[PDB]
């Protein structure tokens, strides 16, 4: 058993020491290596050091080449031999990476063995233009009721998850990953979605817990975890979002649909700021380099909706930004807001009050909107958005009339309705029914503390002896007034049956 | 501007500019070998007596004393007019403190001009008899015609076995120590 | 799970001592005649690379 694996590893470890135009390390320090030699090297070309590390040839100076090292600088000494690979910096891509945890370079760190990749793609690829792009029209179902109703996400959209620390940004992202199991297990290949999670600057224990959570929910079968933890080098943390974006661009360019999450881009910008300050580049706003906007814009422009002549593929981005004291007026959050199509703001104040997810409805918008929703969800979310706007208008001053008390009670019931537990996303039909019950006044006699119990029992009742209702909803694709009257009657029957 | 073999090497810096100007001046005339050998003799005399180098590289002393000392030590070497003018130009711009660099830069020329490529061979133990001559035969076929091999041999027991060969353009690490090191690293990282 | 962990631990220990013994025996495997043969093979490979100009 073991001896066969040893023989396979020995036979596959062919050195092949031929030709090999090389250079010598003049000096090593601050994560940048100066190399004397390598006359015919290209810009942004991957090189290999003598210790097994890899690097990217950044600066093509006359007498030397400046190389950014993807690893620790204690493994490289003065006078080491640097070999060029002949290729601009690329990572393996494919369906072989599904179910795998890799680093920023694509090397697996989960111990599952080698990845049998057949193709590699470069990380510095330009974004598609106007012609190969079409309007975003397919829905991205995260399974969160507040996101799917109020701040909808479409496939190809860039939607920001921005908030302070410990507010549930990673929880929303992981629930979005887990929710795609119903689409992936189904037969419709057009609705299947492949997820990429890029962990940048996090602790290794946190990434291990995330991988275990994805493995328990069986969301790992369509997920690639790119890990660049807090103990890794800054160039690895900078490279990891682009490596994950290339892995998502594989599915984007092959007619498939990919959702990618960068948790979080603020730590990637901190790593890039460290790289630039060690390169003696001029600091700008908050000691950041002046191309950090270009860094995020060239990363996030690769997430787009392709046209039918390009395969009909898509790449959906969910960047994560960690703010300090809820300031969205800082440099990096304003950059990502200007880049992306919308944001999902998470409030610390709502998080301390137990409102989970703590989504600020007044600040979280989506510029796509009605094109990113189904017909029934859009029909009920327009009324929900209007009623929540009326509630926020009347609760700002009331800190009374019968109509004002009715609006306040309706807004309280909708707010308690939008609360959802962690790691349990819902199908779009269940969310449509839940928001329909909340909007249509079916919860007027129900206390706000019993809305969750009513929601669970109503879901059980619909799944038990009301399968024909779900079949009619799926067949029509909306809620007709006749089915609206039937739903009102069976809701009245259910609430009378529960208590009488 | 300057008529020469149009940079047989790629030598940079201000000292490289001085060395290329001296090479152009000594190749327009037929005094290249003479100026090479008197610069070698001057470098040997400076390395022989470090007090002369400390006298030249002293900012306290005036440049007239430095050029008088340079001319005095170039009279006994029976130098030519070109190297005297080169040293006067070096001490005129107060750049004679880097007089070791330009000569070394001038030693970097007449290697490509004579076709000599620098080769470095490092072994676990020094070898002879069956060695050396076969290494020269193997290295002779590595060059286009008109070029020669200048070989430097080193010994280091830390490489366990094998050979470390470096040429002026490429490197090969076909040694036993590095081979078993990467094989053990592969076995540890895989099994 | 106990049987799986016990077998995996024994396999890991077997792999570790096998690797260490292989390293020690490889360091003990060098003979001067084979060293001369390997040096001649390296010289032949260097000459073959010299042919491939």
């Amino acid at each position: 058993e073991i001896s066969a694996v040893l023989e396979e590893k020995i036979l596959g470890a062919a050195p092949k020491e031929n030709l090999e135009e090389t250079g010598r390390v003049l000096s090593i320090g601050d994560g940048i290596a100066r190399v004397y030699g390598l006359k015919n090297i290209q810009a942004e070309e991957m090189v290999e050091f003598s210790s097994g590390l890899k690097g990217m040839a950044l600066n093509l100076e006359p007498d030397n080449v400046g190389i950014v090292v993807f690893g620790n600088d204690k493994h490289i000494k003065e006078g080491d031999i640097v070999k060029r690979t002949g290729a601009i910096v690329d990572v393996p891509v494919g369906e072989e990476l599904l179910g795998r945890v890799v680093d920023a370079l694509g090397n697996p760190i989960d111990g599952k063995g080698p990845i049998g990749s057949k193709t590699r793609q470069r990380v510095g690829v330009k974004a598609p233009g106007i012609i190969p792009r079409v309007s975003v029209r397919e829905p991205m179902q995260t399974g969160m009721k507040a996101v799917d109703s109020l701040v909808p996400i479409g496939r190809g959209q860039r939607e920001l998850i921005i908030g302070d620390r410990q507010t549930g940004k990673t929880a929303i992202a992981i629930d979005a990953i887990i929710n795609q199991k119903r689409f992936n297990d189904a037969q419709d290949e057009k609705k299947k979605l492949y997820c990429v999670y890029v962990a940048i600057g996090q602790k290794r224990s946190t990434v291990a817990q995330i991988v275990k959570r994805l493995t328990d929910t069986d969301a790992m079968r369509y997920t690639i975890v790119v890990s660049a933890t807090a103990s890794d080098a800054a160039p690895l943390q900078y490279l990891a979002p682009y490596s994950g974006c290339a892995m998502g661009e594989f599915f984007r360019d092959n007619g498939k649909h990919a959702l990618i999450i960068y948790d979080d881009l603020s730590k990637q910008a901190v790593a890039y700021r460290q790289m630039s300050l060690l390169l003696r580049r001029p600091p700008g706003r908050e000691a950041y380099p002046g191309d950090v906007f270009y860094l995020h814009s060239r990363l996030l422009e690769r997430a787009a909706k392709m046209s039918e002549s390009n395969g009909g593929g898509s790449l959906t981005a969910l960047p994560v930004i960690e703010t300090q004291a809820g300031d969205v007026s800082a440099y990096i959050p304003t950059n990502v807001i200007s880049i992306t199509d919308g944001q999902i703001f998470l409030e610390t104040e709502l998080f301390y009050k137990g409102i989970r997810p703590a989504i600020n409805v007044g600040l979280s918008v989506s510029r796509v909107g009605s094109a990113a929703q189904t017909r029934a969800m859009k029909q009920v979310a327009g009324s929900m958005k209007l009623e929540l706007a009326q509630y926020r208008e009347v609760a700002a001053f009331a800190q009374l009339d019968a109509s004002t008390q009715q609006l306040l009670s309706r807004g309280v019931r909708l707010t308690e309705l939008l609360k959802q537990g962690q790691y349990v996303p819902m199908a779009i039909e269940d969310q449509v029914a839940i928001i329909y019950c909340g909007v249509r006044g079916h919860l007027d006699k129900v206390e706000p503390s019993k809305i969750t119990k009513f929601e669970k029992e109503f879901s059980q009742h619909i799944k038990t002896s009301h399968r024909d209702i779900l079949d009619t909803i799926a067949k029509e694709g909306q809620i007709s007034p006749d089915t609206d009257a039937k739903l009102k009657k069976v809701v009245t029957d259910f609430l009378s049956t529960f208590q009488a | 501007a300057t008529q020469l073999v149009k940079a047989p090497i790629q030598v940079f810096g201000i000292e490289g500019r001085y060395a290329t100007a001296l090479y152009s001046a000594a190749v327009k005339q037929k005094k290249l070998e003479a100026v090479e050998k008197d610069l070698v003799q001057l470098n040997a005399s400076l390395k022989k007596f470090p007090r002369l180098g400390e006298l030249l590289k002293n900012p306290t002393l005036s440049r007239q004393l430095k050029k008088d000392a340079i001319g005095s030590m170039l009279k006994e070497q029976k130098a030519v007019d070109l190297t005297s003018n080169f040293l006067d130009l070096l001490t005129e711009n107060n750049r004679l403190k880097m007089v070791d660099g330009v000569i070394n830069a001038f030693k970097t020329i007449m290697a490509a001009h004579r076709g000599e490529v620098i080769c470095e061979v490092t072994s676990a133990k020094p070898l002879d008899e069956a060695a050396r001559k076969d290494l020269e035969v193997a290295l002779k076929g590595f060059l286009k015609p008109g070029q020669n091999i200048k070989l430097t041999l080193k010994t280091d027991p830390a490489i366990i076995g094998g050979l470390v060969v470096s040429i002026g353009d490429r490197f090969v690490d076909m040694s036993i120590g590095t081979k078993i090191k990467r094989y053990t690293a592969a076995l540890k990282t895989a099994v | 799970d106990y049987h799986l962990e016990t077998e995996r631990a024994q396999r890991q220990i077997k792999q570790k001592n096998m690797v260490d013994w292989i390293v020690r025996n490889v360091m003990k495997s060098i003979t001067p005649e084979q060293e001369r043969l390997m040096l001649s093979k390296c010289i032949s490979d260097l000459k073959a690379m010299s042919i491939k100009a």
Partner: peptide, 28 residues
Amino acid sequence: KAVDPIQKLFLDKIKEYDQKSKAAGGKL
């Protein structure tokens, strides 16, 4: 085939260890 002497020596040592482990009954 141009089999490297180090790879062949490593394979011979692995086969030697496997034969000795069979002689030792699979013990360490």
